[PDB]
Amino acid sequence: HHHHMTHALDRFRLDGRRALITGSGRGIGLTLARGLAEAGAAIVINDRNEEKAATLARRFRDEGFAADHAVFDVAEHAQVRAAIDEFEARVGAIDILVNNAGIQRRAPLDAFEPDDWHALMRVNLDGVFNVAQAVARHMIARGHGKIINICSVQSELARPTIAPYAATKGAVRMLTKGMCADWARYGIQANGLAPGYFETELNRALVDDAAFSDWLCKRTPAGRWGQVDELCGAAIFLASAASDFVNGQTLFVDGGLTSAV
Amino acid sequence: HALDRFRLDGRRALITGSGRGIGLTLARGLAEAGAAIVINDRNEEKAATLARRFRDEGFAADHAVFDVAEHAQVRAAIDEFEARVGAIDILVNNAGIQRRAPLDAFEPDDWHALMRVNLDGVFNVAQAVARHMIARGHGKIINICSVQSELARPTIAPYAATKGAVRMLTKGMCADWARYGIQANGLAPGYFETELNRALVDDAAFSDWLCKRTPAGRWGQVDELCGAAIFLASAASDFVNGQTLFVDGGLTSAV
Amino acid sequence: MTHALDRFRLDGRRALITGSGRGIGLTLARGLAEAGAAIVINDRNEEKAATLARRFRDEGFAADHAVFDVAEHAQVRAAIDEFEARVGAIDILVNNAGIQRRAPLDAFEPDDWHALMRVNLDGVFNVAQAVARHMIARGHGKIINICSVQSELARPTIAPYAATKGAVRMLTKGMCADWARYGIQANGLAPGYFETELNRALVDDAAFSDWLCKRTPAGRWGQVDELCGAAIFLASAASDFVNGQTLFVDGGLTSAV
Amino acid sequence: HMTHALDRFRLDGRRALITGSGRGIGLTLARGLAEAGAAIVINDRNEEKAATLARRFRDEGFAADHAVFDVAEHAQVRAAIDEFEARVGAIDILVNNAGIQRRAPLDAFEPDDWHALMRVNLDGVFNVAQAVARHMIARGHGKIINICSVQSELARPTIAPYAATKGAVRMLTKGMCADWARYGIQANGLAPGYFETELNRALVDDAAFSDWLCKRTPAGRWGQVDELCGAAIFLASAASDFVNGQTLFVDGGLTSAV
Ligand SMILES: NC(=O)c1ccc[n+]([C@@H]2O[C@H](COP(=O)([O-])OP(=O)(O)OC[C@H]3O[C@@H](n4cnc5c(N)ncnc54)[C@H](OP(=O)(O)O)[C@@H]3O)[C@@H](O)[C@H]2O)c1
Ligand SMILES: NC(=O)c1ccc[n+]([C@@H]2O[C@H](COP(=O)([O-])OP(=O)(O)OC[C@H]3O[C@@H](n4cnc5c(N)ncnc54)[C@H](OP(=O)(O)O)[C@@H]3O)[C@@H](O)[C@H]2O)c1
Ligand SMILES: NC(=O)c1ccc[n+]([C@@H]2O[C@H](COP(=O)([O-])OP(=O)(O)OC[C@H]3O[C@@H](n4cnc5c(N)ncnc54)[C@H](OP(=O)(O)O)[C@@H]3O)[C@@H](O)[C@H]2O)c1
Ligand SMILES: NC(=O)c1ccc[n+]([C@@H]2O[C@H](COP(=O)([O-])OP(=O)(O)OC[C@H]3O[C@@H](n4cnc5c(N)ncnc54)[C@H](OP(=O)(O)O)[C@@H]3O)[C@@H](O)[C@H]2O)c1
């Protein structure tokens, strides 16, 4: 007689949406690209290397996903705009942007090399502006879009030797609020996704350091490293209609680290 | 099967103060995601009849009667429910009240009433349920916060104190209970048309101010809170702990 | 040519410090008196408060006392109104009285929950409301609410205390929202870790101290005199455009993982 | 008593460098710090402006010198700081004040304006803090005060890139604390609300903005620049020796309220 229905849960589906993930040739970006595709999105692989991005997109199509690619260095403003505009003209609309590309360089701030400072600013901060601006012109024209900026625990709490990275991630957290202030009126939700400590290549030296890992497990209420699949749920949520009234916020996925001494 | 990340099959959610308002909306949303739900009201006939209407709509639904402000009464009702109906795996601490006046004019009875419902009540129900969640080694606790967990508005300083308290109490639940497989998080709504906010909805000047103050340019609609609640109740948020997620159309991110 | 520095002087101002019979409150009372304030010692014990005020006077300070339990709303209001009329205006309020009770939240006794709420949260409301009525009417006043690291970051076994201190941090913003228009600056002062009787169990535990020193960028416990500068600043004209804020004095603890 | 209490805040025997102190908040803070007893160093990109101001402070009875550099030029800053330390002496207090503002909706924002903001407001803080901190760390004491903004916390339309720079500076401040508190450095932020300087000329001249601001601010008014001196002296003095990694907002209540 009765029929159980699922309206509030169905709003998590991404069917009919296209997501571009910057730096999705490997790492968290590739993990999130697959998670968003599984949730129904067409995806766009981004890498600086054309052959790599095109081949990865083809492997997604072999698995039945809708996938394409867009080649650019996020730090190159004009190059990014040309690639985004060409993709919109030839392929179609980008409805979700995940600003994932990023790098890490560790040293005490008094010894930090200026070239390392500059490289971090170009990728982690200039890059987020370059791709968001280029995509947002098209989202504004359509009156809807999602922008998800990958942040960090260092958007809130500092650690020794990574002061420049923390500067870039505090910048992205505020740039996210600024995207909301300028674009919420056009139906765009711009939010931050801040992972805690995840076992990945960016952090391999930390994972392999027994002293650091012992400290991290005591420091984190959850008592462990995160694993990258644990970010997919948050990314899907922020990309979906289920979060249409979430805007300007940064969601920390860190096992409780930022909530505790 | 990507939606499976967010499904609540086999879990039961209790929503305090779910006879009307946001609590009723969240109960429906969690049930649609697959949870069995528990209606809470201080009036047994109202709670039980609402649960019956959920069951008529194909949802698994029961009820539990208590005033969240009464510590021993809550514990007795939660323990009785756990023994007679079954495990509560998700707790939404939603019951709350509002009383507005400049702080220099605030009546101590109103101060006390806000503290009892919005702050004691979160402790009373969370402690009673968490004893059982700890024994099972898993649970979700979602505490309903507010914009006033972060930004103050004139005439609601005592409410803001309760919602700042609940935001920190949420971090404290994580600190004590993450080791037992419990994730405790806050969900802070912006502005929604419920009876809590009747005076604001009916004030054209306030509504005009709110639409300019909110980047999204409008009031929220209560169903826009279900996604965040389902996320924080599901395995999709198992590595989210001690956080408060604001669902406010951008209000707290902007001047 | 010292204008900007004379903005820290408190001459001509009177400061009430709740719970100033011992601990941080007594330290802050002395610090404010040294900066020129007349001070009011508060304790629940009439003889203790009277003795402390007399000894401050013996050292050349202007001091009086006002006896009340911060948790008792009517008793606080009566004592504040009586003092305002008999002795004179209170221009600075330091809401310092507070308690701590530690236990895992699932075992927390409701009597201990209630005690923490009554002192740490009701108490701040009770004294702030009573004093602010007078300050608002005069058009000037400073309210300084003593917060904690637990206004922002939790620690196991002190979730109820954290609730009270998160409440006080937001109540501070609400005081600003209602009262800044009347010339009141209401701000929070959040100490990090200090060796008072509040924290005796922590001071006495070398493993806790080892954790704290490694957790704190400054690498040490604070010393209670290191709180006086912040209190004088927030009590003085030097902070007339600071409002609704909570200043953490914690050696960097809350800024770091 | 009074000597003991004011002693907390006195800056006698200390030297403060204020970047971009040719005008605006930086010049006001330079005067406030000198009034509290500090020897001061005026910084401007133009030698004749910095030299003239430093002489004017000396004519008024203050100890004052000048150091010319563009905060955005890493190697130039390093050479200028090291030369000042070698020839004149220790810099004990650094106020990273130099900054600019460029306003446009983000989708129309010019890359040249984005880059200008990053170079001054973010690179510049790194460039001068690194150069000075090397000396402070070696001595085992120092104060760094980074000028932030309401936009270190709350966004406003048309200034998203500036907000990015000020969120960056707020976190960089925490990073300075994490790396250098162990060496006796206190690094903190001072975030002004709204003040009538040339930075904000377009806002002062916009009656609708001013109307909005006075309603938005619990204090109900613009700040006056002298209201920032107290916070700067506090963060430069012994009174703040256990304050580290924090950003103090001086904004009349703005960031605390809806
Ligand atoms: N625990 C964590 O790992 C963690 C925690 C918090 C935040 N995050 C953030 O998560 C994001 C992804 O990090 P990850 O851990 O996946 O690091 P990763 O394994 O090192 O991957 C970084 C990705 O960014 C790409 N990339 C770098 N510079 C680029 C540029 N100029 N243009 C285009 N793509 C570029 C890389 O491509 P190439 O192969 O060409 O190098 C790679 O695909 C970053 O923003 C990082 O800050 C990570
Ligand atoms: N825009 C918004 O509405 C908004 C924004 C931010 C936060 N919130 C929060 O959302 C929650 C729900 O509020 P609402 O807007 O839905 O308000 P509402 O329509 O007034 O509903 C409040 C609910 O709580 C119940 N309740 C009150 N005191 C209770 C007690 N002692 N024991 C048990 N139940 C009790 C009420 O039951 P009765 O029918 O018996 O009165 C009612 O079901 C509250 O925590 C509120 O602070 C709301
Ligand atoms: N590291 C720290 O010590 C630390 C850190 C952060 C925040 N704090 C805060 O700093 C404040 C002072 O704490 P403390 O460290 O100085 O603690 P303490 O040594 O235990 O002193 C607490 C003071 O409050 C008084 N008090 C307690 N309940 C009272 C009541 N009902 N009415 C009036 N006075 C009452 C006590 O008087 P009796 O002698 O009658 O008990 C005593 O003078 C508290 O708000 C505390 O939360 C302390
Ligand atoms: N309400 C406010 O005014 C307000 C609010 C919040 C934060 N702030 C911050 O306060 C600081 C001072 O701003 P303000 O209001 O005083 O602005 P202002 O009147 O425009 O002054 C800015 C100062 O920085 C200097 N400067 C700019 N770029 C420089 C560079 N590359 N190298 C060296 N000096 C440089 C300027 O020198 P020139 O004379 O050569 O241009 C000028 O002396 C900035 O960091 C600003 O973001 C201001």
mmCIF file of N, CA and C in Angstrom, chain D residues 75 90 178:
data_model
loop_
_atom_site.group_PDB
_atom_site.id
_atom_site.type_symbol
_atom_site.label_atom_id
_atom_site.label_comp_id
_atom_site.label_asym_id
_atom_site.label_seq_id
_atom_site.Cartn_x
_atom_site.Cartn_y
_atom_site.Cartn_z
ATOM 1 N N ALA D 75 64.551 41.164 -2.677
ATOM 2 C CA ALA D 75 65.986 41.355 -2.443
ATOM 3 C C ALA D 75 66.307 42.784 -2.029
ATOM 4 N N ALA D 90 69.363 47.972 15.892
ATOM 5 C CA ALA D 90 68.349 46.925 15.909
ATOM 6 C C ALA D 90 66.951 47.481 15.658
ATOM 7 N N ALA D 178 53.951 30.365 14.852
ATOM 8 C CA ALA D 178 54.327 28.960 14.933
ATOM 9 C C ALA D 178 55.831 28.779 14.737
#
